[PDB]
Each structure stands twice: as structure tokens, then as C-alpha cells.
């Protein structure tokens, strides 16, 4: 009830043994009443590292998008080594969403080893189960076996109606995903452990399918963008091997489905200027000049009867003399060019200062023997050259024209494809302009460039007109156990990619959210802009180039920091050699580097002077000892991981304040949230995701099932808890309900339709759906709906939630008017009472933990000891936690070796990985998540609690209690003991 305190463990240890006398009864009682539950106690178990590889093929559905819906790919399996390293080899194949699926090495949900189907953004198939939401559901197939050598799996995705289907060895899989979210791009993905060999058969040259695709399902090789190539790659890496060693990479620039749909400018609506007869006629005539030049240059002639084979020009006259639809076509398109220029910031003009007289308008080619003679050319490029602004203007017009053309094709029903099929309404150019190839860009730009030259000749005066933030900055610091408070230190940083990279020394309390240099903790230098950031921007030195090495040297005794670029010491504006000075020692300093999106860089702390470059230039001469020179093991670095996690609300929060009004008279205990600085200076309001620390767990078996009636009190199974939204807080900005342990949606514009939900339907041999089930990560009801149903509200909205663990349904009731919305959940599910709110008033919300007639309070469900206590209570453990977007994480010392190379045109793209790799995982029971045991080096509270837990184990096992030793062997095994013995870190 109170929580984890090591003093209680010490009390139990004292209870075990006294002055060399072992109380067998006490030891057995403590063991029996503590260990079998395997709850409220840290658990450890060896697991395997799992990696994932995608095919670099991104597809998705959007309104007006230039992409095809149905898709189909295939993966074959060559070799599988089951039960390697004493664990079953993990192998799953499926699809994944770009925004939401981001596996990390170790320390995942459940007990680690996350792969395809361990989150609501991924859907997979392991051979016998359909993996989604970290829940495995068996599926019926003719040959039911795990993925074995010499078997092939065909995966098809239908985006028209959301569906993913699998087929193993031609036998259909009687189960399909459905009704999933379409907010992103779907790409093929395979998750695997060591000792496996798979091969992608992408399509066409990139392997051919063994089995024919289902009708309407195009091969996945037809979705490759023109500017990109088909090649396997990891999903999201934060490190990469290279000739210099481990290169730290930043975030990767992503793509969205809204980029494929084009949004042009409605230039046809713009009213044409009076220029139509003034200069538009001359522009069209100059275009006729260049047209005739094209015909003359080609083998084309001016023959009145149109004969392409004989290359005859229909008009066949120097002057175009074209019929009205022809002449009007030329004039209308010149007018369209004028409309586009007018719609943009440019303004048309005829002020040429009589440049028309100076224009030659004579090509004098003398090669026009046919009737379309006297080819004119103004030599406008010679008369005036195009300015760079004009060239960018040409690019803008070309982009707009392409966008309108694409919109037209989309309206008709065309889709992009790497292979052109006119009968199939597919072309390789429907992709919008920004992703075009340079050849097509030039082909679309040449005519507009000539038109702009004509405009210059005729004198045109046209003149050209939070959550994401965490995904741009990644911080790589050293561990807090490597802090240096004295001496001279040096470390180097090579800029492989130039831009948005800051390197320097930071204090151990460096937060993972605030940018480096914005706070006084980080004394960083940005070499992209040549500015040193300690608390604010200040120019210093010169910007670096590609491959430049910056050496950071720190004088702890002299209280200075010096930055050198390629050996040369960088100077400030005033000429000071040292970037900073008079710096207080304090807690210490640690090397730190931050990289932007798409930026890579090498970090050399100085483990070996041989690999340390430019050391003898400056660092060795003054006496700067390289950082981490004598230590044998490499420095364990900590990277900033952008994964939203729920953490307790700090009491020192300057914006939010959670107060316990528990023990109120004629009122159940409650926790009220208030805004400390509402309506004041620098006050910030934003989405707040709050939850309760302790969950409620449904029963394993769903076997149905004034003064309150005591019999009903004892035999009831329902639970009640309310949330009071205060007067002045708009109910339209609140959401009351429950959340599963897996929830990491830090959306500032959260809406009830943004939740993740996937329906798994398991069918029979006839295709009839025998079972239908839904998986969602949260269940809330919007208070805006209740307030709409019905200025300042002047009333308090008491939304009460009722949950039945016996049957598995939760139903809501707003203020007492009852809510028709209800949710059904699976057995063995733990839910946290949570609310999502946008603060707009001083008093916002109040979590009330109470009871109704014939209804248990939430405390009875939360605590086993008080399961039969009708009186509500708020023990110290129960607390309000808020979602935190960014947290610190530890980089694993070793990573898997995966080869993703294609074997041939027939074999496909072979992915192999055989080097075993394992780690010790520490599991938190209530949160249903695990983390690395080596991460306890900075988590001192958990380290102390686990040390006292081991001491308690030794205490209960003390003095020859062989039965207790055997009981312990179930929890802590020989493999765990030996791995902990060999664990150096």
C-alpha cells in the first residue's frame, strides 16, 4: 500500500534470522507470502536481442494521393536455427507504420525483444499466431508450424478497405487484420533474432514471386520513387559502423502521405491583364519562332498535308496562320503563363524602354527552304541574362504546371508506377514535382526558361515573392560516472555531415528536452554557424566543412574551455582564444554532442592516441590528457530517447500543482489539479496527459458475474471512480477514461479519433469470420459530447466510470445522466485511470476515488489487502503521473551483425544474422515493461531496492534452508547467476 521502501525489506531480513538462529516458521511464512505473487518486486531474466529490416518501399492512402492501393510482396526462409543460445529464434514478417513503429535495441515492452506485432503500429505473422499489440492469437492453417527452412510467406495489403492478409506455402491463413489506422505510410518489415536467414522477393528484377499475386495486387517493386533506389536498410538507427568506427547519426528525415497528393495554385481564376494583345501575342509569336526552329532543326518539313512519317507541318506557313482552336490554344497557354506570373508575387509589365526595336528577331538560319521560312530569333539570351531569382521563378511555374497536371491525372484515376502501363492507367511521372528526376525537370523547364527570356526582352518587371522538436535533436553524452572535476581533458569530433551539430562539455544534470546551450548546463559550440552557446547565442570562430575535426579541450583548474578546428585555435570576435572562462567546477563535466535530422558525426573521446588526430598539435602540447585514455573498456554513452513515458508530476513544477484533498468530510478522497501560473507572465497551456500510478487488472476467466446492502457489497465485482471537471474549465477540452500500459501518444492536437484501434478477424475454412476482436491502447469519452448533449459552465461535471472485472465491460455516466458509450475488454488486462485535458482555468479537474451504492471503490481493486474494504482510501503509493515526451536511455555495448545484401536477380535480397547476443532484463511488474539491468548505474533507487531484495533472498536462504533455496532457484536460475558473474559492467 505505501510503496517500495527498503526499510521494510530490512525489517523482513531481521525477521528471518536472529543472532545465528534461523526462525524456520518466519522464513517459510515470508517466502510463501512474498515470492509466489511475483509482484511489487523487481524480476530478472535473460532475453535475446531482436532487430528489424525494412524494404525501403513506402505506400499509403491519402485523399488525392498519387499512389496505388493494393500491394503484394513475398519473403522466403532459407535457414533457421531454432533454440539457439537457449532461446527460441524470433522471426516475424509483416507491415509497419512509419510514424509510431520505432524499435530500439533491448529494454522494450513486456520482457524486451520487441519486433513486428509488439505495438499497435505493427502487424505480423510468426507461423501460428497473428501478432499485434503484444498479444498473440493462434490462427488455423493447413500446415501449422513455426517458420521453417524452405517455406515462403506472401503478404498482401489492401488500403481501400484496411486489410492485411498472409498466405503460407499457398495455403491461405484463416485470419486477417482490419480497421487499422491509415495515418502514415506502410512498409514491409521483418523482425528477427540471431541465427536466421530470410530473403525478400520484391518483384521484377528484385526477385520474382514463386506464386502468382492475387488479382489487382501489384508487385512492391513498382512503388520505388524515381529519385530513390530499392535497397534494404534498418528502421531507425542511432549508430552506424564505418572506417573511423562508430558514427553517431541523428534523426532521419521522414515522408508523409500528404506529400504525394499535389496542391497546385488556382491560376486560371486570376483575371488576365490587358497584356493579351500588348505582349501575349508577341510571346506566342516568339514561341512559333522557336517551334519553326525545332521543325527546321529536325528532319521535319513544312508540308500542308499533315504527315508525321514524312514530317510535314500542317500549317506549313512562316506565320502560324493556324485555325482558331489552334491559335486560341497558343494564345490561351501564353495567357496561362501570364496568369501564373500574376498569381505569384510577380507583376507583369511592358516597360522595356523600347527594347522591341533593339530586338533582332532574326535567326537567319538559311536552312528554311520550305514555306515556313524566315525563322526569327531575338537573341534574347545575348540581350539579357536570366537572374537567379528569375530561374527560381521558372522553377516555381514548372512546379505549378506539374501540380495541376498531376491533379488532372488523379481526377481521371491514374496512379504512380515505376513501370509504365497506359492500359492500366499507370505512369512513372505522376509523382509531384519536388520528387521528380532532374531530366524531367529540365524537360519541363526549358520552354518556360525561353518564355522568361522573351519576358526579359520585352521588359518584364516580374519579381519573385514540441513533439516534432524532440524528433530533430538527439543528444549523446557520457555516463554520469565519468565526471571529471580536475585536470586537463581533450576529445575530438569529426563532422561527416555538415550542419546542425553542437559539441562541447555539459554538466551531469543536462536535461534531455532543452536544447544544448539554451541552458547554462551546456557549454557547447555549434560549428555549423560558428557560434558558442553557454546561455545564449554568440558568434565564435568559423564554420566547419565536411570532414573537419573539432577538438574540445577543457581546463578544470584554469576554468576554461577551448575549441580548435583542424588544429587551428578558433578566435572570438574580441580575439580571445578561449571560448569560455571563469567556469565554476561544481559537480563536474562530461563530453556531449547533439546532432540534427539527417546529420552524422564521429565522436572520438580519446581511447587511443593512435586514432586520436590533431592531438599533438594543441592537446598534447599544453597538457590536455585525452578523455578516457587509460580505461580498458570503452566509455558507455547515454543517448536521448524520444519515447513518451508516464512519470510522476514533480512537486516543484512551476506550472501544475496536484493537491491531496483526501479525508474530506462527506466527500471521498480526491486529488485536485491546479494551474500555478494561470493568466500570468510566460504562462504556457498545452495538452496534459495524466494517469494514476496503480492499475486495475481484470480476472483471468470471464465467468459472467440509502444504505448499501452488505450482501451485495460482499458479492459484487464492480468498481467506481469519478472525475470532476470544475466550473470555468470547458468540457470540450477533457477526456475521461482508461489507458493500457502501452501508450506513447504525445499529440498536442489529440482527438478522440486519433486513438489506435485494430480489429483482428479469425475466419474458418469457408472464409466466414468465426471470431472478431478489437485491440486499442486506451478507452476515453469526450466531455465535449456530454456538454453538447446538456459562457462559463457554472457547474461541475462529474464523469463517473464503472468497470466490471468479472465480465469485462466499462460504462460511463456524466454527472448522473448516464452514458450510452461502453467498452468491452479482454481478460488479463490492466488499466490505469487517466484523463487528457487542455488547461483553460485555474481549477481544472479532481480525481475522486469513491464508491456508490452496492459498488466497490477503486482502492479495493488496486490493493489486495483492502479487497474487502468498502471505505475508500488513498494510500501514499497512488499518485498522479504526467506524460513525459523525452527520457534518457543507455546505448548497448554490442549490436547485432546483419547483412542485407541481394544474392541475385532470381534469389532476391538475402538478409542474414548469426552472431548470438543476449542481455539481462529487469522487469517492473505493475508497468508491464522491462529495462536493462546495466541501466541501474544511474537509477540509484532501483539499484538500492534490488540490492536489498538480493539481501532478503540471502536472509531467507540463510542457515541451511534447502527448501527455500530450491524455491529461490525458480526465481534466480543458474544462467542468470553465471551471466551476472560474467557481467563486467
Amino acid at each position, epitope marked *: 500500500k505505501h510503496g517500495r521502501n527498503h526499510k521494510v525489506l530490512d525489517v523482513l531480513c531481521s525477521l528471518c534470522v536472529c543472532n545465528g538462529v534461523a526462525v524456520r516458521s518466519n522464513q517459510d511464512l515470508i517466502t510463501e507470502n512474498l515470492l509466489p505473487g511475483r509482484e511489487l518486486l523487481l524480476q530478472t531474466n535473460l532475453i535475446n536481442y531482436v532487430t528489424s529490416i525494412r524494404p525501403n518501399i513506402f505506400v499509403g492512402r491519402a485523399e488525392g494521393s498519387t499512389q496505388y492501393g493494393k500491394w503484394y510482396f513475398e519473403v522466403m526462409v532459407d535457414e533457421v536455427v531454432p533454440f539457439l543460445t537457449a532461446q527460441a529464434t524470433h522471426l516475424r514478417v509483416g507491415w509497419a507504420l512509419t510514424e509510431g513503429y520505432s524499435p530500439y535495441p533491448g529494454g522494450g515492452e513486456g520482457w524486451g525483444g520487441n519486433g513486428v506485432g509488439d505495438d499497435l503500429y505493427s502487424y505480423g505473422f510468426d507461423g501460428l499466431h497473428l501478432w499485434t499489440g503484444h498479444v498473440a492469437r493462434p490462427v488455423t492453417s493447413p500446415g501449422q508450424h513455426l517458420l521453417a527452412p524452405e517455406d515462403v510467406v506472401s503478404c498482401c495489403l489492401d488500403l481501400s478497405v484496411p486489410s492485411i492478409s498472409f498466405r503460407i506455402n499457398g495455403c491461405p491463413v484463416q485470419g486477417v487484420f482490419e480497421a487499422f489506422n491509415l495515418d502514415g505510410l506502410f512498409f514491409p518489415v521483418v523482425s528477427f533474432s540471431a541465427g536466421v536467414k530470410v530473403r525478400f522477393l520484391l518483384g521484377g528484377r528484385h526477385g520474382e514471386f514463386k506464386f502468382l499475386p492475387p488479382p489487382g495486387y501489384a508487385p512492391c517493386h513498382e512503388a520505388v520513387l524515381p529519385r530513390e533506389r530499392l535497397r534494404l536498410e534498418p528502421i531507425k538507427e542511432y549508430r552506424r559502423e564505418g572506417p573511423r568506427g562508430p558514427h553517431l547519426v541523428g534523426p532521419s528525415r521522414c515522408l508523409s502521405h500528404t506529400d504525394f497528393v499535389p496542391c497546385p495554385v488556382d491560376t486560371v481564376q486570376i483575371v488576365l491583364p490587358p497584356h493579351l494583345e500588348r505582349i501575349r501575342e508577341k510571346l506566342a509569336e516568339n514561341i512559333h519562332e522557336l517551334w519553326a526552329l525545332t521543325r527546321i532543326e529536325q528532319g521535319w518539313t513544312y508540308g500542308p498535308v499533315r504527315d508525321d512519317n514524312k514530317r510535314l507541318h500542317p500549317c506549313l506557313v512562316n506565320f502560324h496562320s493556324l*485555325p*482558331e*482552336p489552334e491559335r486560341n490554344y497558343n494564345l490561351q497557354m501564353s495567357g496561362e503563363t501570364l496568369k501564373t506570373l500574376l498569381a505569384l508575387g510577380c507583376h507583369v509589365g511592358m516597360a522595356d524602354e523600347k527594347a522591341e526595336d533593339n530586338l533582332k528577331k532574326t535567326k537567319l538560319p538559311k536552312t528554311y527552304m520550305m514555306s515556313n521560312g524566315y525563322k526569327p530569333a531575338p537573341l534574347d539570351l545575348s540581350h539579357v541574362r536570366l537572374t537567379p531569382a528569375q530561374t527560381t521563378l521558372v522553377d516555381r511555374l514548372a512546379e505549378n504546371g506539374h501540380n495541376v497536371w498531376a491533379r488532372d491525372r488523379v481526377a481521371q484515376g491514374w496512379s504512380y508506377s515505376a513501370v509504365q502501363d497506359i492500359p492500366a492507367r499507370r505512369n512513372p511521372r505522376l509523382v509531384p514535382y519536388r520528387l521528380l528526376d532532374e531530366a524531367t525537370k529540365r524537360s519541363n523547364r526549358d520552354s518556360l526558361c525561353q518564355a522568361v527570356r522573351t519576358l526579359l526582352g520585352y521588359g518584364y518587371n516580374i519579381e519573385p515573392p514540441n513533439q516534432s522538436r524532440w524528433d530533430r535533436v538527439r543528444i549523446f553524452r557520457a555516463e554520469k560516472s565519468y565526471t571529471v572535476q580536475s585536470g586537463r581533458w581533450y576529445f575530438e569530433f569529426e563532422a561527416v555531415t555538415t550542419g546542425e551539430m553542437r559539441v562541447g562539455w555539459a554538466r551531469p544534470e543536462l536535461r534531455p528536452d532543452v536544447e544544448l546551450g539554451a541552458d547554462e548546463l551546456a557549454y557547447v559550440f555549434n560549428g555549423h554557424r560558428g557560434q558558442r552557446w553557454h546561455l545564449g547565442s554568440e558568434p565564435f570562430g568559423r564554420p566547419w566543412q565536411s570532414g573537419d575535426v573539432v577538438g574540445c579541450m577543457i581546463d578544470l583548474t584554469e576554468n576554461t574551455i577551448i575549441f580548435t578546428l583542424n588544429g587551428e585555435v578558433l578566435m572570438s570576435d574580441s580575439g580571445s582564444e578561449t571560448a569560455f572562462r571563469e567556469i565554476e567546477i561544481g559537480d563536474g563535466f562530461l563530453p556531449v554532442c547533439s546532432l540534427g535530422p539527417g546529420q552524422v558525426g564521429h565522436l572520438n573521446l580519446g581511447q587511443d592516441v593512435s586514432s586520436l588526430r590533431f592531438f599533438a598539435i594543441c592537446g598534447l602540447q599544453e597538457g590536455f590528457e585525452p578523455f578516457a585514455i587509460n580505461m580498458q573498456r570503452p566509455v558507455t554513452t547515454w543517448f536521448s530517447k524520444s519515447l513518451p513515458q508516464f512519470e510522476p508530476v514533480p512537486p516543484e513544477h512551476p506550472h501544475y500543482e496536484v493537491a491531496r484533498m483526501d479525508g474530506t468530510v462527506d466527500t471521498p478522497p480526491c486529488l485536485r489539479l491546479a494551474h500555478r501560473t494561470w493568466g500570468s507572465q510566460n504562462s504556457l497551456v498545452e495538452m496534459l496527459f495524466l494517469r494514476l500510478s496503480l492499475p486495475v487488472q481484470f480476472h483471468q476467466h470471464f465467468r459472467c458475474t440509502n444504505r448499501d446492502d452488505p450482501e451485495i457489497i460482499l458479492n459484487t465485482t464492480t468498481y467506481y471512480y469519478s472525475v470532476r471537471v470544475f466550473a470555468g474549465q470547458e468540457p470540450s477540452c477533457v477526456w475521461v477514461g482508461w489507458v493500457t500500459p502501452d501508450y506513447h501518444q504525445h499529440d498536442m492536437n489529440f482527438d478522440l479519433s486519433k486513438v489506435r484501434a485494430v480489429t483482428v478477424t479469425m475466419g474458418d475454412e469457408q472464409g466466414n469470420v468465426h471470431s472478431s476482436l478489437k485491440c486499442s491502447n486506451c478507452y476515453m469519452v469526450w466531455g465535449g459530447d456530454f456538454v453538447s448533449p446538456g459562457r462559463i459552465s457554472h457547474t461541475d461535471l462529474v464523469i463517473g466510470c464503472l468497470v466490471d472485472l468479472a465480465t469485462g465491460l466499462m460504462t460511463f455516466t456524466a454527472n448522473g445522466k448516464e452514458s450510452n458509450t461502453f467498452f468491452q475488454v479482454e481478460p488479463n488486462t490492466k488499466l490505469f485511470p487517466a484523463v487528457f485535458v487542455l488547461p483553460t482555468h485555474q481549477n481544472v479537474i479532481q480525481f475522486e476515488l469513491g464508491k456508490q451504492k452496492n459498488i466497490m471503490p477503486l482502492s479495493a481493486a488496486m490493493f489486495l489487502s483492502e479487497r474487502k474494504n468498502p471505505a475508500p482510501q488513498c494510500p501514499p503509493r497512488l499518485e498522479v503521473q504526467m506524460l513525459m515526451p523525452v527520457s534518457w536511455s543507455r546505448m548497448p555495448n554490442h549490436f547485432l551483425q546483419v547483412e542485407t545484401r541481394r544474392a541475385g536477380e532470381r534469389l532476391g535480397w538475402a538478409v542474414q544474422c548469426q552472431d548470438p547476443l543476449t542481455m539481462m532484463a529487469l522487469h517492473i511488474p505493475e508497468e508491464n515493461r522491462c529495462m536493462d539491468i546495466l541501466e541501474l548505474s544511474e537509477r540509484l533507487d532501483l539499484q538500492r531496492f534490488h540490492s536489498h531484495t538480493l539481501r532478503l533472498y540471502r536472509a531467507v536462504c540463510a542457515l541451511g534452508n534447502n527448501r527455500v533455496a530450491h524455491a529461490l532457484c525458480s526465481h534466480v536460475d543458474q544462467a542468470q547467476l553465471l551471466h551476472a558473474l560474467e557481467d563486467a559492467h
Partner: nanobody
Framework: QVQLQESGGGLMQAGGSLRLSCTASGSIFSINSMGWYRQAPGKQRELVATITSGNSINYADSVKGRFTISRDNAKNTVYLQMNSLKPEDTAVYYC?????????????????????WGQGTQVTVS
């Protein structure tokens, strides 16, 4: 969106009379050069005589037999009449209205490729 409904070209022996009607329903702008093509079963697609506004007809390799093809801009209609027939004339014929006039577009690829295919009909010769 410009949709070119094409109806006609029923089966007939050699020398029969076949009438085909191509109507281009859609925006009146850029309605021109409602030309013709044919795709033979398992063969190459060939350009039939293309008629444009202004009574301009361009002939090509697919002018077998005797076509009489005439278009009216009032209702965007094209009447094609084959009075003779040959065994090699069996194909799926198509009618296309492109903003390209009289087969001319000395301009950007977007303007040139801006086009509107239709449905067509099957012509079979016994």
C-alpha cells in the same frame, strides 16, 4: 473530367458498314483533336486517322479500308464509318480527346501529356 463514350463497331463480314460514335462529355475547355487508336489482340497499338477542330484530318498507318470520320463541336461528337473491311482490322478501338491540336504541341511535357482517354469499343471482322 472528360469521358469519351464510344459505341458501335459491331461484328460484320468483309465489306460491311460499321458506324461508331464518340462523345466527349466534360468541360468545354481544351476539347480538340478527338483522335482514334486501336489495340489489336496481343499486338501493337496503332493510330487511326485523327480529326481535329477546323476540319483537319491526319492520316497514318491505321487508315485501312475506307473510314469517313467527321466531328461536330456543338455536342463533341465524332462519327466514324467503315464501309469496307479486312480480316486484319479486328481490334479494340479507342477515342481520345487531347488538348494537343492537329497533333501539335511545341511546349512543356505537362501540357503535352495532359490528356483524356475513354472507353472505346471492340470491332471484329469475320
Amino acid at each position: 473530367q472528360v469521358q469519351l463514350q464510344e459505341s458501335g463497331g459491331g461484328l460484320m463480314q468483309a465489306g460491311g458498314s460499321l458506324r461508331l460514335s464518340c462523345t466527349a462529355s466534360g468541360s468545354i475547355f481544351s476539347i480538340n483533336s478527338m483522335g482514334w487508336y486501336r489495340q489489336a489482340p496481343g499486338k501493337q497499338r496503332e493510330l487511326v486517322a485523327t480529326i481535329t477542330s477546323g476540319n483537319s484530318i491526319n492520316y497514318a498507318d491505321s487508315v485501312k479500308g475506307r473510314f469517313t470520320i467527321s466531328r461536330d463541336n456543338a455536342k463533341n461528337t465524332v462519327y466514324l464509318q467503315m464501309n469496307s473491311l479486312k480480316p486484319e482490322d479486328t481490334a479494340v478501338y479507342y477515342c481520345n480527346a487531347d488538348r494537343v491540336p492537329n497533333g501539335y504541341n511545341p511546349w512543356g511535357t505537362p501540357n503535352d501529356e495532359y490528356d483524356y482517354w475513354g472507353q472505346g469499343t471492340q470491332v471484329t471482322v469475320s
